[PDB]
Amino acid sequence: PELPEVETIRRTLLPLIVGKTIEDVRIFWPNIIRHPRDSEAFAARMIGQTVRGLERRGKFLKFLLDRDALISHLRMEGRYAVASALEPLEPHTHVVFCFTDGSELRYRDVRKFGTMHVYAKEEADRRPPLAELGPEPLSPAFSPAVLAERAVKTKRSVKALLLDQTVVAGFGNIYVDESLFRAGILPGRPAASLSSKEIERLHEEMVATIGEAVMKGGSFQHHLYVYGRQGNPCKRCGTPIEKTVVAGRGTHYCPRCQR
DNA sequence: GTAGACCTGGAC
DNA sequence: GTCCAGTCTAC
Ligand SMILES: [Zn+2]
């Protein structure tokens, strides 16, 4: 999931857990726990704390408790669900938070790529992994000036630049490909080759795409122009969409609309 | 920048 | 059987 999907999770999960107190924490795949390194310490410190809020920073979810904050990244396939602690768990459930009212928050992740870090609230934003993140795209903090500053400094592809969470936080493979198509820019061109006009246009489309995706509850799949449409005609010019590899990942684009 | 890592299951 | 699907690492 990318920013739109994570934001949809944040909004829907909050009312299902706010106000509940943690009674136990069970871990079935220790590698997911990154800090504290010892999973026994990770579990023990959360017992007795109550959920007070849930925020999002980039692609991360930030569970706010009493003293601590739990920072969770779903990576490629992580997912959360709330259910009765009396029922059998679903396959691939690796971490479970048991509440005093008999319900529980379950974390599932088939590929086991997700991560979890716990810090005191005041230290969360000053320690990894949140410390080095770029600005939120839907905030005044993200502007053309900010994009140009990083752009006019590197020769790597513009797609590689957009996937860099230190530049701006929240974009993944789908929304980077969609934003570049809407702005009319080829994904493989050097970031330093973009003109000032191209930068302003890219910024504008990035904000519009991510904003619209949030409103639609994420993949919005019926509104995709290029992602996963290789071999199909472009919705704007009819030219077949193509797929290659850029920045080490699948890349979709229209050879006529993007230059 | 270009494959491999970490891991598992679906489509061809 | 073989290719495909968010970050970090080593040549
Ligand atoms: Zn086109």
Side-chain angles (χ1 to χ4, degrees), chain A residues 76-78 80-114:
Chain A
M76 294 296 277
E77 301 191 6
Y80 281 102
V82 178
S84 170
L86 298 178
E87 318 180 314
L89 294 175
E90 293 294 62
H92 305 293
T93 304
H94 304 131
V95 182
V96 177
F97 303 87
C98 312
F99 302 117
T100 61
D101 73 352
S103 69
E104 48 179 42
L105 174 61
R106 310 171 178 180
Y107 178 75
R108 296 176 64 184
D109 191 343
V110 177
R111 304 185 70 183
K112 297 177 165 66
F113 290 177

Side-chain angles (χ1 to χ4, degrees), chain A residues 13 38 106 110 114 138 230 234:
Chain A
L13 190 57
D38 186 353
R106 310 171 178 180
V110 177
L138 297 178
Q230 59 266 40
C234 176

